[PDB]
Paper text:
To experimentally evaluate the significance of the electrostatic interactions between the VP4 trimer and [name], we treated BAV virions with alkaline buffer (pH > 10). Negatively stained images of treated particles showed smooth BAV cores, and compositional analysis by SDS-PAGE revealed that VP4 and VP9 were dissociated from the virions after alkaline treatment, suggesting that high pH treatment could indeed disrupt the VP4–[name] interactions. Because the electrostatic attraction between [name] and VP4 is weakened at high pH, BAV core particles can be conveniently obtained by alkaline treatment of BAV particles. Cryo-EM analysis of the BAV core was performed using a similar procedure to that for the full and partial BAV particles. The core particles are DLPs with a diameter of ~70 nm. The spikes have been completely removed, and the upper domains of [name] trimers are fully exposed. Accompanying the dissociation of spikes, the fivefold channel for exporting mRNA transcripts has been widened, and residues near the fivefold axis moved outward. VP10A near the fivefold channel moves more than VP10B. Negative-staining TEM showed that there were separately distributed “fibers” surrounding the incubated core particles, also indicating that the alkaline-treated virus particles were transcriptionally active.
[name] (BAV) is the prototype Seadornavirus, a class of reoviruses for which there has been little structural study. Here, we report atomic cryo-EM structures of three states of BAV virions—surrounded by 120 spikes (full virions), 60 spikes (partial virions), or no spikes (cores). In the full and partial BAV virions, genomic dsRNA segments and a number of RNA-dependent RNA polymerases (RdRps, VP1) are packaged in a double-layered icosahedral capsid consisting of three proteins ([name], [name], and [name]). The spikes protruding from the outer capsid shell are heterohexamers composed of a VP4 trimer capped by a VP9 trimer.
Author numbering:
A (entry chain J), C (entry chain H): 2 to 302
B (entry chain K), D (entry chain F): 2 to 299
E (entry chain B): 353 to 403
F (entry chain P): 1 to 249
G (entry chain Q): 1 to 236
The structure:
Amino acid sequence: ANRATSAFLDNPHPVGVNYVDEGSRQFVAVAELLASKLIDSSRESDESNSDVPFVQAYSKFADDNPRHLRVKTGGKMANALTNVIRSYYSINAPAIVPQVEIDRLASKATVSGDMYNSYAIFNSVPIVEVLSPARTTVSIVGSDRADVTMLNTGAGAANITFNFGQIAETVILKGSVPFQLARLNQPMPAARFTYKLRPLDGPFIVVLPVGNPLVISATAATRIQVPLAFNKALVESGFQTAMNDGLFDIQNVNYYSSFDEFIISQYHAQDGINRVSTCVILGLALQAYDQMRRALPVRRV
Amino acid sequence: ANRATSAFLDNPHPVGVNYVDEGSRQFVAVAELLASKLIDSSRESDESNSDVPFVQAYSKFADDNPRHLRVKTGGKMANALTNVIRSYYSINAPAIVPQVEIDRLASKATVSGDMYNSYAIFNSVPIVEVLSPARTTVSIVGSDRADVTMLNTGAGAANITFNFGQIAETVILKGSVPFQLARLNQPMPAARFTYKLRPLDGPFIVVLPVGNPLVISATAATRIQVPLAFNKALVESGFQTAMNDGLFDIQNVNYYSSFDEFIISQYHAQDGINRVSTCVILGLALQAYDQMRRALPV
Amino acid sequence: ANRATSAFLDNPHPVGVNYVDEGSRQFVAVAELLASKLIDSSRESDESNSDVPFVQAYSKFADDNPRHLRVKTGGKMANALTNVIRSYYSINAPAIVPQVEIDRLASKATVSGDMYNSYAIFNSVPIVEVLSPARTTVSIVGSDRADVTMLNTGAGAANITFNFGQIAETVILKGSVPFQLARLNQPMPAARFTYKLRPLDGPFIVVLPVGNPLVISATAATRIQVPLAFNKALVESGFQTAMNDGLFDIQNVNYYSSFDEFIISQYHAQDGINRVSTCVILGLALQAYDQMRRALPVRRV
Amino acid sequence: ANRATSAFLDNPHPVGVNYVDEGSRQFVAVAELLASKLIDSSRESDESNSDVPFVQAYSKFADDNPRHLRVKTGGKMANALTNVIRSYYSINAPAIVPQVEIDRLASKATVSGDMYNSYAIFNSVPIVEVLSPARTTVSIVGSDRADVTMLNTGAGAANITFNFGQIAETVILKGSVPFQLARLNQPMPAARFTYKLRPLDGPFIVVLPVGNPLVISATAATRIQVPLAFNKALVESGFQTAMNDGLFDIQNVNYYSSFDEFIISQYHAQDGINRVSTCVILGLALQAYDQMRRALPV
Amino acid sequence: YRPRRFKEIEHTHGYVYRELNQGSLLPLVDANLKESSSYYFKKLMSSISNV
Amino acid sequence: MDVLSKGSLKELLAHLEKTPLEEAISYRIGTVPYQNVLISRNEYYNQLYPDTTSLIDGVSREGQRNVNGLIMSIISYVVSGSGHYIPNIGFMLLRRSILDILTKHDTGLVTNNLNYGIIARNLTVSKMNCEQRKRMLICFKLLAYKDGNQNDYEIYLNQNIPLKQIAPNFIPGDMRTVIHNQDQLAIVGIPAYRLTQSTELSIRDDNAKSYKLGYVDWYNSNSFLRERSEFNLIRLKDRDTKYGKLNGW
Amino acid sequence: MDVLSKGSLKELLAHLEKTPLEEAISYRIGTVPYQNVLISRNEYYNQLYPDTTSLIDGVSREGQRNVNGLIMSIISYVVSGSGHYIPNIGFMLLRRSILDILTKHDTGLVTNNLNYGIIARNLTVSKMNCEQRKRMLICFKLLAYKDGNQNDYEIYLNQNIPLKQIAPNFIPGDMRTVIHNQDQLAIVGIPAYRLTQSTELSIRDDNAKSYKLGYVDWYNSNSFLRERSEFNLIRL
């Protein structure tokens, strides 16, 4: 009867369909590589007590030698990168970057826009639906570690069906007390604390005894193809920086607590294979954004 | 009415007021730089089957050659680094290390003591107060992810007031079931799963219907100016080690699970901007402490 | 019976009693001279397409050269100037700058430091007190031009007393319709549009008939000793910048629309002669604050 | 409910989207610089008895030598400056001047057209709306100093809502008699003559006692980024000259008393940020127009 | 870097005449350097001793 | 970029002869033409910068499939350097030159019902500069002569006084008029003023500066053609000659 | 500047012998201490920066005319370089040097009945660094030994363990302890390389930095300017 679902999986907004070609991917890859040099040069400048390494690196990134009074922000490369990031997030984004600028910026470094060289593990738990009987209450909280608290007020033991989707590879389940769980139309095993499940096996049935509530903690692992320069720590920081600076405030879009929740949510949708490819490019662009903004701080408190 | 507040935001103890000048900040930056070279040299020593790289690195850090019979404490720099960490945590710490020692250790390397050339994001959720009417029970659990559980036993729907402070930049607010939330003196919108909010634009009201409890998860991000060499992975490891080593065992102080909880709690004091700079310098010292202690365990 | 007074003349808060000696006055005069050089050097740098003129002026002003990847705010000279401006406004504002810093900064230039070389004319019109009979309504609006609207209902020939104080030099009265005005115990002259009055002559009585509201517009002129470098345009612009930045956000203080109302309100209070001396030094400091802040713009919308 | 607004804030007309590139901005800055030297040449003509300083400056400005036969107009630079001003005011005005001519005129001087290296203070008072109950009458008069006259004829006191917009930095309120103003959902303060407000905080409630009328005088200050060569006195004079000369005579536009009212009105549009940049360039051009037309009147 | 100290008499009573104008190379630079570039390049090549 | 660098009418008309219609089409999805958007301009403001998208831009935009859209995409290519997205045009049209589309009857396009006022509003004319407007009037004149609606061209010019003054003067069928024209139609070129690498606020202005800075790099690249230094290396067809004539005309 | 430059107990005690009490006190009214204020630090933040005014800020503050006010003014001069405003002290006490006020019975001042805990609280001992703490304890020991209150000095040190660790090792009556003392008490001094001309957040930190930066210029250009005034005059 009752149906419960994860909050972050509901209504994934469409992603952009622009700047997804070979030349555009080279522009994103070049930006990440040159932004990395910007951070490294700034550290070296501090150690050597000379601004030459930073001035030299900023000249490659921004194609200009800065003046003292004018604030340093990155120039055309920063402008193009910031607007392209907006275009990836939603369809409604203006997408106002010319192709001449993209081609010129992609020619700064000899790098390849390969977004399928390696993989990464994304630990967000997808709970598509949890179907429960009438006298039982189910609440789902959390995304990185989902805690499903279920209480059986009914007279007899109830069966609750778990649907974790088909994208995730491994889901590990732990409970406050040992509990019974098995696949659809299969014998119930002995009560155990921990289960390791393949989400493709099928809907899973859990037995809820009458009495104290049972809380099941869930953890998932999904593998998504990403470039070899992908760094999850830098991507998350860039995602927060972009959200705070107001680059994602577009009409009719969904806001996610992490890039982990964003990429998994788009995966768990129709044409999700194509959506993930765009989201991966957005991830590397966000990684470039974080490195570039940390080396060139503008906001003051 | 009932008031609920975050545990980590209650009674932030005063931080130390010493070793925050330019000379002392250069000492901390030098300590981090030399500690990083110590870790790198040990790795190079293992790879090349020679102790020459480690001897040079330890000689610069400790001003003495390593010896097989003696123990590798780290020298006077290790003692000074431990003492400044104690003074940073609380104002009741002794703060014994003299200035002539601080200046002599800052002259080992040439690094600026700038602590405002970059920024870092701290994902701690400040919930200053959650005002609740009678018959409604509100519980706040967690700091990195704050889960607020509310249920009403009354006949009608209740209004719950949320205050997230004036420091956090954005707060993303996710509920177990769709719920309505709006600012003061604003129409209530249709129920929806997620909300993005700026804590600055006044308190927020959430309509709580009668029935099953509503659990709402909060996530916040705050930008604080930090040095370029800041590393949250290293700082958090150093925070745990210093707490394990008793560097923070001073009377009339509070304790925190992680460094981000410490920096947000001190930010939310009566005048929190005073303590942020001192807390930031403490973070860089803990990063140096973590690298040095891993190379030279005791 | 009824009494009316100008809004800006009510409860003038005390001014600071610090940084009023000869050495502090020399510091303010030095700041104004060097801030002017900053503005001209910025104009020269813009025309010459080089940073040489600005670096020389900033180095003299801030004892440090302009720094890349670091906002240029003015260094210790800017910090000292900003804090003394706050101290001049109110006693509640603290005294933070030490005497050693001021003496060091006062030695940069060779200014005289005299505060009584010249004069300035201020246009704020002081209406200390307007006394009206029981059936007459009186309203005072404005500071640069005061519009006094008076209505008489019933009876006839209500007598309204005007008290313009003793500080103002000349006051000019203009009426919508010709009106009668004369001093105490003097015959009333034929009705005429305008009057020229010396505020020291005494209280002025104006005859107000029934119906037909009569509005009197008053403009005043007051002379205050000021330095030769005093420029009212720069002082007023500096006043607004200081208010916007929050330098005057002190407890138990009064806020004014312009520096004209500030200096006149302090002059009309008790011991106002010694208050004006501090206000003039605040004016010169605000002149330096304006030119320094326009040369270096920190605030970005 | 009666709603009263400032007269100058209504129906801001679209501004021109031309001559805002780097080359065109350099042209306006060159015109300001060369018109300034033209005025100064008159004084340098008086120290001697010759007209060589004026002839020298006119040739630089107009690319032609002055002649006693004809009235000195200004040459190609005068026509370009006049037409560019018209294009700034309205989008319906044609962009007559070619870009090749502008590029040629921009090479006369070596100035850089950076229009965001300074700021200016604008004193127009934005009153978006004043909402009053049925019995009360509210009248708003003036732009530089807003005199709001309110009379209450009902039995009880009235609450009047003031909305000063979200652009002005500070607003100072002075009343004829002491009055009480508090922000929404905040306790009323005692009666005072002067209130200092930050418009971003929220709408303000004013208590109107029954009896004699209450008049409030408002003064506002707004900071707008302008070029360093900006002179507010010179800009205002040029605006009056351009209005008199008929440069602004074009269908479907709004007319303003001063450049203070013009820039604030545009800033308070739906997308007023993009209008302010064009308005600032118009002010610099108007500053050059004032200097040039005074030296060479037609 | 720091300057070396003078004699004690020069520190107590010494004075020096200095000019703070640094100048500019733009008047020489700002020209049509097309024809003079070849002559300047020949002098440039001769400045460094040749193998 | 190459089209925007053409200064004379002879050079522009020669370029439209060589260039096939496929360069006017973009093949990229773009976005909706007229839409109020918030863009990021961090060099000037922290707050997002409001702007309105338009057809005359350096980026692809969605265009109508009819003959009206095809004409508009050609004009947008000439005045802005980038065309529109018109899906599934036949290969016969795409291989034809731009000049053939505007001035020949062999193509199957029917343009007799074209309204010049509607097109001028869609390709916003109040936003174009003088050189862009001159290029548009060249395209309108070529369409009028092919269609016989030369009167409709004149009535349109009489309704707009500034356009009539700056209207290029040539006969679309006589080459002698083209050679005599002294009009300058170069949107991008070598700048006499100082051109920096800073960004601009509006989408049109920022996009135009990208083309301006790109041309300077293209000017100093090896692809640029220097007549005074390599004139003997040029093919006889592409060498500058006084007797060069367009096909027909 | 001269007092903060002394780096040894011998030099500090020698300086206090040659310095009259006039230099310790100041004639500027200043402001009342212990006030929560907002100051401007535009180097770092756009908003105003909170701080609390203290007696060791380095800026003259109002003080009472009792014995405690005079002692607090002396200690502030030693640790911050500037004293407080005590109205109308009198010529009799102004001519006396600082050490005689601290360690002599001929000044006519009753320095007994002095509470070191109250004085330490008023001087914000929790905010001063090791060198400033050391200098404060030196003044306390001199006062205690002159009035025969060595027990009260020991009681104060026992209650404050952090101050007991860094207590000075000299005995006021013995000269051998003074000469062999190895304490470092130099707040300011000529530094190797240089220090950036940048502001600091705290009132104490910024004022202390202003003393360090100006010490180099004061060191080179003080002898002639002081001599011009010293010539043709009699010392107090």
